[PDB]
Amino acid sequence: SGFRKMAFPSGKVEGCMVQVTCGTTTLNGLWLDDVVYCPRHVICPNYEDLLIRKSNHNFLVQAGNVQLRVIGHSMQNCVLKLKVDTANPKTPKYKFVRIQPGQTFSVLACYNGSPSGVYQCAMRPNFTIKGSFLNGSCGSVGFNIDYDCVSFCYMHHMELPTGVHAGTDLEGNFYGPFVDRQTAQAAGTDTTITVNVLAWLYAAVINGDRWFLNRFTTTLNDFNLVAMKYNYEPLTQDHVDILGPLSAQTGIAVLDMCASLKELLQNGMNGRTILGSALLEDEFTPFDVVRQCSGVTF
Amino acid sequence: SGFRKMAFPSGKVEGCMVQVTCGTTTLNGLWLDDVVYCPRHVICTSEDMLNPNYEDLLIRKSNHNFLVQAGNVQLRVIGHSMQNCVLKLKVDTANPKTPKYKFVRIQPGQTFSVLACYNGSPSGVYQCAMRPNFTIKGSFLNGSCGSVGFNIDYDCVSFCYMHHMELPTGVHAGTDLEGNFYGPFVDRQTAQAAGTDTTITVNVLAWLYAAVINGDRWFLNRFTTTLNDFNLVAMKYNYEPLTQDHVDILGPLSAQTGIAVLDMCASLKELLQNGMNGRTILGSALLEDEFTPFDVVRQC
Numbered sequence A: 001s002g003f004r005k006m007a008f009p010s011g012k013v014e015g016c017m018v019q020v021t022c023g024t025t026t027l028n029g030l031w032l033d034d035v036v037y038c039p040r041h042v043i044c045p046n047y048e049d050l051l052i053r054k055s056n057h058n059f060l061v062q063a064g065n066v067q068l069r070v071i072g073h074s075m076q077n078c079v080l081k082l083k084v085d086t087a088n089p090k091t092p093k094y095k096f097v098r099i100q101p102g103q104t105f106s107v108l109a110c111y112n113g114s115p116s117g118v119y120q121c122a123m124r125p126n127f128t129i130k131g132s133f134l135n136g137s138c139g140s141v142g143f144n145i146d147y148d149c150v151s152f153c154y155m156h157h158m159e160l161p162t163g164v165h166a167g168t169d170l171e172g173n174f175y176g177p178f179v180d181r182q183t184a185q186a187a188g189t190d191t192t193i194t195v196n197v198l199a200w201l202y203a204a205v206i207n208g209d210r211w212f213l214n215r216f217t218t219t220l221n222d223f224n225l226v227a228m229k230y231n232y233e234p235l236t237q238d239h240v241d242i243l244g245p246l247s248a249q250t251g252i253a254v255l256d257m258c259a260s261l262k263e264l265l266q267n268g269m270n271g272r273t274i275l276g277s278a279l280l281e282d283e284f285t286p287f288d289v290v291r292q293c294s295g296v297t298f
Numbered sequence B: 001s002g003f004r005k006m007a008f009p010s011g012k013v014e015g016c017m018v019q020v021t022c023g024t025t026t027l028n029g030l031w032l033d034d035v036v037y038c039p040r041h042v043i044c045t046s047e048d049m050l051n052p053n054y055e056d057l058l059i060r061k062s063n064h065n066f067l068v069q070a071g072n073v074q075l076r077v078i079g080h081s082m083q084n085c086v087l088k089l090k091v092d093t094a095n096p097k098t099p100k101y102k103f104v105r106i107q108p109g110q111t112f113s114v115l116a117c118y119n120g121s122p123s124g125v126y127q128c129a130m131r132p133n134f135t136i137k138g139s140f141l142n143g144s145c146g147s148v149g150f151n152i153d154y155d156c157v158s159f160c161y162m163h164h165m166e167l168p169t170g171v172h173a174g175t176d177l178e179g180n181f182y183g184p185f186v187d188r189q190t191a192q193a194a195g196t197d198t199t200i201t202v203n204v205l206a207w208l209y210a211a212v213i214n215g216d217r218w219f220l221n222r223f224t225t226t227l228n229d230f231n232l233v234a235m236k237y238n239y240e241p242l243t244q245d246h247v248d249i250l251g252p253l254s255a256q257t258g259i260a261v262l263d264m265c266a267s268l269k270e271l272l273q274n275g276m277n278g279r280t281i282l283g284s285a286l287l288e289d290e291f292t293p294f295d296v297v298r299q300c
């Protein structure tokens, strides 16, 4: 029993964290095989012009107490790729994946190439992450683990004026309408990840919390009218299908759980909590709930 | 900026997780140097669980009864001893991934990371606090016994907890790495109940300082209070008494934010009286008590 916000074990990623220094800037890099990936703002803009002026010896790469030698440099979108002479012996089985809003991933927050913390979080529908990052955290990565394969999905680049965070996939493409330049940027109005709230309501039922359940069911169209009104993301037939296994395990049809969510949005919690929370949690996907309420290992 | 519940990176602990099998029971072990530590109840059958004589059950065991698996490699048990509720299995191979480590016993209110494992394989990492009633509110399924709680402060892993049991309310009980249980619990299936839980007051205050450091000030007030008056109010909301030690520990956060501890205590009193009124503090509608003053200064 119990339900916690749980991150993937970070060991496979810790063995890839390196420190990257160029000029006065120091941030984190991801050392995979003979390449170190890091935010291109470490050279800081005309990034092509700035990069052509740099030579390999300008980039100081440090893996533990060992300095790696840069033998090449190239740029792919907002990520800088520093070719090094040594392949990382600790390189796990990995792939670069771009995630969708609502999907969750674990973040290994680093400072000076040294991992300091791991937390679980979701790509908000406005493409920001509500992370916890200080100066020096740039280059920290977001990932998921599937069997023994690490899926790198995020690299930290910047903090928006509201304290929320913006970054790219490992191919340097930003999530959201953000740029890696000093300019006025604002995160759009955020919405709640509806499929994730429903998954978390199923986790609460699996843990014996049933007070919010009701005899009612709704149509998907009637629920989506309510979802729009309360700044909740639309629920698609895909989401309903993905929630299928949880619906089967708990005996509560997805549209039956939607009528519970609808009542919760219109009436509130009334001094009650769900899984120790007075708010509806939207940072557990349907897969996260199945994984935690079944015990899948890595 | 930003404030998250953050666990320590689990890599140093993952390299120590092994699977321990004795008869029909399989749970997790902690492989450090040439010793594997695990809950002593791995030697029990389900008919032994009510009133087990662990000394008597262990004397009947031999080294080859204990199957230890580190990855796809079986380790050979060359000795076994018991220290309180932990079983120590001497093995013929020192773990090459053994980090710099120490065994520390923690106090209620202290936080730590948990590497939840099943069959010697890590599946998740989360942040926990030792509750004032000596239980932990974990996320543990059957097979999680032997999963460990730890803190990583400067390359050294401090092992502080090993999971042993789930109480009828879904909360968890376990021991330090010397086998001494936290709380009045025993590793028997006899009727056991967690005492009434209370909120870790010093941790809530630390989290209110983190909220101020992050620019949230709506809950602050012009009032101060005496320590005794704060404790008389707080106890009525099932909050732990705040000692002069807690006030002293909050000193650095009080200095950084310019808000005296007894002034923050008055803001807490008011929050307890009024509730949040549809507002949140650091994205939470409840007062968070699983961030110590040390966690706040570290993260901020």
Ligand SMILES: CO[C@@]1(C(=O)Nc2cncc3ccccc23)CCOc2c(F)cc(F)cc21
Binding pocket: A041, A133, A134, A135, A136, A137, A138, A157, A158, A159, A160, A179, A180, A181, A182, A183, B001
């Ligand atoms: C890399 O520096 C910047 C930054 O956001 N840094 C940060 C990233 N994370 C957490 C932070 C916590 C506190 C202080 C800064 C943080 C600030 C300067 O402007 C820029 C900029 F124009 C583009 C850019 F991609 C990054 C940055």
Ligand SMILES: CO[C@@]1(C(=O)Nc2cncc3ccccc23)CCOc2c(F)cc(F)cc21
Binding pocket: A001, B041, B049, B140, B141, B142, B143, B144, B145, B163, B164, B165, B166, B167, B172, B186, B187, B188, B189, B190
């Ligand atoms: C042998 O493990 C036991 C147990 O609690 N295990 C568990 C530990 N964690 C999460 C669990 C989730 C669901 C089911 C069991 C869980 C079984 C019950 O009896 C006992 C017992 F009297 C003493 C003991 F130290 C352990 C246990």
Ligand SMILES: [Cl-]
Binding pocket: A242, A245, A286, A287, A290
């Ligand atoms: Cl699923």
